[PDB]
Design a binder for this molecule. Sequence first.
Ligand SMILES: OC[C@H]1O[C@@H](O)[C@H](O)[C@@H](O)[C@H]1O
Ligand SMILES: [Ca+2]
Ligand SMILES: [Cs+]
Ligand SMILES: [Cs+]
Ligand SMILES: [Cs+]
Ligand SMILES: [K+]
Ligand SMILES: [K+]
Length: 603
Amino acid sequence: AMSSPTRALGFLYSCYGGVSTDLPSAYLGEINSTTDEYVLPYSWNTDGYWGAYAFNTASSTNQDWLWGTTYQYIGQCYLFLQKLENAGSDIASDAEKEQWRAECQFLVAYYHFATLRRYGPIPITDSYIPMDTPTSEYNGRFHFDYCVDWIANQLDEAAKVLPANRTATNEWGRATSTIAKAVKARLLLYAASPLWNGSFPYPNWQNENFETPGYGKALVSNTYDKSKWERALAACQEALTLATTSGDRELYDDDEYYSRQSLNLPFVPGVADVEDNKEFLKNVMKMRYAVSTRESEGNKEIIWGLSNQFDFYSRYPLRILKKSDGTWHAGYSGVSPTLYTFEHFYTANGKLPEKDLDFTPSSEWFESAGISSREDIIKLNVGREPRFYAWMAFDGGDYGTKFAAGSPLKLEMRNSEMHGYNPSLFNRDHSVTGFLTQKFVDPVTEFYTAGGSTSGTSAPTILFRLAELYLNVAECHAALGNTQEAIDALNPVRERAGIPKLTLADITNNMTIKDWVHNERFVELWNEGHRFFDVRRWAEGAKYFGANKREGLNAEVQSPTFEEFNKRTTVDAPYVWENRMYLNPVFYNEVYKNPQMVQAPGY
Ligand SMILES: OC[C@H]1O[C@@H](O)[C@H](O)[C@@H](O)[C@H]1O
Ligand SMILES: [Ca+2]
Ligand SMILES: [Cs+]
Ligand SMILES: [Cs+]
Ligand SMILES: [Cs+]
Ligand SMILES: [K+]
Ligand SMILES: [K+]
């Protein structure tokens, strides 16, 4: 029970059990595969929950009940805390008890946050609830702003006690003050956002028979409050300062890991491997490693990462390599980046393709770039930023480095017997848009002719990393009209990625400071489980997630010509946006079970 130090530690370990909820980058997860970043084949809607959320068929009886999990571990935390109060000096010292209490405090707060960000106003559960508790005493939802204040206060208390950094020695990353402050930063940032700060779509949604101190039956603010941005800024600043001092965090900036691993610099159209281009090409590899390495490999950017892995086959091309037995190594090729993605990664000059005077006019984006032996490469895919070539892949281009028996795999997205659409051969699997991503793919990844393969060295799945803290501070400054300081916050991230810094001159009526911040966030944290939340908190669901917004190439036709393939094509699946989609529906049974609980609007 708590009959010994090792038993107690085991109990504490089990309290961390819910932290993988809504895991970033997991391809079947709705926070990953329902945004305008990329789409999955419509026929994959039978797998997981992503379909129900993308196509608005989620319901109180058809939903991902992560609430079940978060409050489960919240209860586990308070159960632990209860037993610990009765535990003697034989179990743990007073100093260690203090540490354990802080860890639980952080976990409870985080678990509430994980629930809040999906469900909106939630019941605050700050004790263990005995199963014989009368139904009349169940908490209902507390007003969003009440929830925010409590979570924030809990994180601040934990932060007083927890260490700022820990050495990574195993797969259990225990809480730090740095993580506590980072969570609070993202929390307040969300809270200051339009959805929760003046633009909630259902102003009249409220409690029926439950009161929040300070708010009565109200559940969400309907009035813009600038002070929320002020507090968010201070919180984001503090998180950044902590992380970069006693947190011992810094942006991954190693330009030579590829070299130490005996790899060639990557092929990039229009950027040959010559002396003058070394910096650009090394930046491409830097950005591949930045999101696929361990601290033991020199990465000090991760604030909170998990040992939990996510699947890669879903992003690999179809036929990878023919084995000596005549059979093929194959991927699923389902993770399909949209034209929105391909149009909002930057040009080499650090600008949007549409906006960049030095970039191809949109009228010519789908023409061949005329690259010898790679004529399939269209002009849109030439002249882009390092992050583009690091993380994206396209017809005529290379996928990976060691990928196919030690060589990069050239993509043939129009070939029905290689990487193109062909249900008779590949069943459900194909790129929906004619693009692919190789983000998170270890450069050492390699499939062998003799059979078997390697994915190099695994890396933690990232929950919080330092680049985000820069972006969070930038967004707060932007909201407050601090233009130079917003710029100052973005520039370390831009500089690391090998594109030009911003100046005041770049802020105009054609590209606002908010445009820059939001787009830098779109790019840097692409496929890291942010866009789902960011579009929602910005109250821009209809704009970005609505019907017909998602586009790609003409990729669901067999054996197309170059000309047939390279046409702007609406993704042909029943994507929609409706306002109820901002919030996750509450499990039917829970609404029934808790008399004080109210369903999300529209469900
Ligand atoms: O989730 C989609 C995937 O589902 C698997 O069960 C299948 O083996 C893959 O080919 C791919 O279709
Ligand atoms: Ca790796
Ligand atoms: Cs309003
Ligand atoms: Cs242009
Ligand atoms: Cs109810
Ligand atoms: K660490
Ligand atoms: K171009």
